[PDB]
Design a protein around this ligand. Structure first.
Ligand SMILES: *[C@@H]1O[C@H](CO)[C@@H](O[C@@H]2O[C@H](CO)[C@@H](O)[C@H](O)[C@H]2NC(C)=O)[C@H](O)[C@H]1NC(C)=O
Ligand SMILES: [Zn+2]
Length: 323
């Protein structure tokens, strides 16, 4: 049986001709204004916000001509203030297929106390992620639809709710969603019901994205596990600025750069990675120079980036999936 095939996969590099067509088949002003901004509001749990968002998504997907199958995992937990609810979102093309490329932001904000009209939002941290993840199945829509035949392998999106700790980051004041997804992924098997094959077996990669939207970032590579793939972003990022599908960018300041090895950063990803899942963690390091200050907004953003960085994986994602 499969479960071990996951670790043989290598991609289909396309050519310029194609490489052109969807460096132009993406508009980061379309993203800015349909996907992104109408999330720029306070969207941590309990909040009127944690719905205007959640909901916002849902149709943002399904409105699409491709093939998504959308699930709200929702549950009740221990907040250092009591028993708030939580709502993980789970987009899915080909559910029956049984190995998946998946991308996954945190869809919530930080709670921040209320002493004036000003209020947190989190641009970079992190609606920017989700926003691309949204671009990323718009732009390449029908390419994604073109696969109903129907080996087993497709595309899961995930939006974790409860990235952050209320008062105080801890092993048990944080990640709420993430963890609750693991032993729920783990519990349940697909095939339904292939005995020693649950949901955590078909998770092919996991490219978690956080802190995305500053000028001039740098992403380590943490897990050699998945750096063979990191190599793809070495690779994409050059066969590419060369041909100049890249604005306001040079390769003597690369962000997909290789040295920050086996390092102590703790997102939503840890407990997945801790059923040995191969995970890929991508996250301006050092942190956007405004992280969490009230100043984590539009202002200090930068189209360019997001974008360029929006293409890029809209290749990898392919590649992987033999387009
Ligand atoms: C770029 O790659 C594609 C193949 O992925 C080439 O065009 C395709 O070629 C075959 C014809 O049998 C089919 O896969 C498609 O019908 C073609 N169309 C499209 C739209 O991709 C294309 O010629 C290659 N470009 C080069 C080599 O410059
Ligand atoms: Zn944060």
């Amino acid at each position: 049986a499969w479960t071990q095939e996951k670790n043989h996969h290598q991609p289909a590099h396309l050519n310029s001709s194609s490489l052109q067509q969807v460096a132009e088949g993406t508009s980061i002003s379309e993203m800015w204004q349909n996907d992104l901004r109408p999330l720029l509001i306070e969207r941590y749990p309990g909040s009127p916000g944690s719905y205007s968002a959640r909901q916002h998504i849902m149709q943002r997907i399904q409105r699409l001509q491709a093939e998504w199958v959308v699930e709200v995992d929702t549950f009740l937990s221990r907040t250092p203030y009591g028993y708030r609810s939580f709502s993980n979102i789970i987009s899915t093309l080909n559910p029956e297929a049984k190995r998946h490329l998946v991308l996954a932001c945190h869809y919530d904000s930080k709670y921040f106390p209320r002493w004036d009209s000003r209020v947190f939002v989190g641009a970079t941290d992190s609606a920017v992620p989700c926003a691309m993840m949204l671009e990323l199945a718009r732009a390449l829509d029908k390419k994604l639809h073109s696969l109903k035949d129907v080996p087993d392998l497709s595309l899961r999106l995930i939006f974790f709710d409860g990235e952050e700790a209320f008062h105080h980051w801890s092993p048990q004041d944080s990640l709420y969603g993430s963890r609750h997804l693991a032993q729920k992924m783990a519990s349940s098997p697909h095939p339904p019901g292939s005995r020693g094959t649950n949901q955590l077996d078909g998770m092919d990669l996991l490219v978690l994205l956080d802190l995305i939207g500053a000028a001039n970032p740098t992403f380590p590579n943490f897990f050699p596990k998945t750096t063979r793939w990191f190599n793809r972003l070495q690779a994409i990022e050059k066969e590419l600025y060369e041909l100049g599908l890249l604005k306001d960018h040079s390769l003597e300041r690369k962000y997909f750069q290789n040295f920050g090895y086996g390092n102590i950063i703790q997102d939503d990803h840890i407990p997945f990675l801790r059923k040995g899942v191969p995970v890929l963690h991508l996250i301006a390091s050092p942190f956007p120079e405004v992280w969490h200050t009230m100043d984590d907004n539009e202002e200090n953003l930068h189209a360019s980036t997001i974008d360029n960085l929006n293409k890029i994986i809209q290749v990898f994602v392919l590649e992987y999936l033999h387009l």
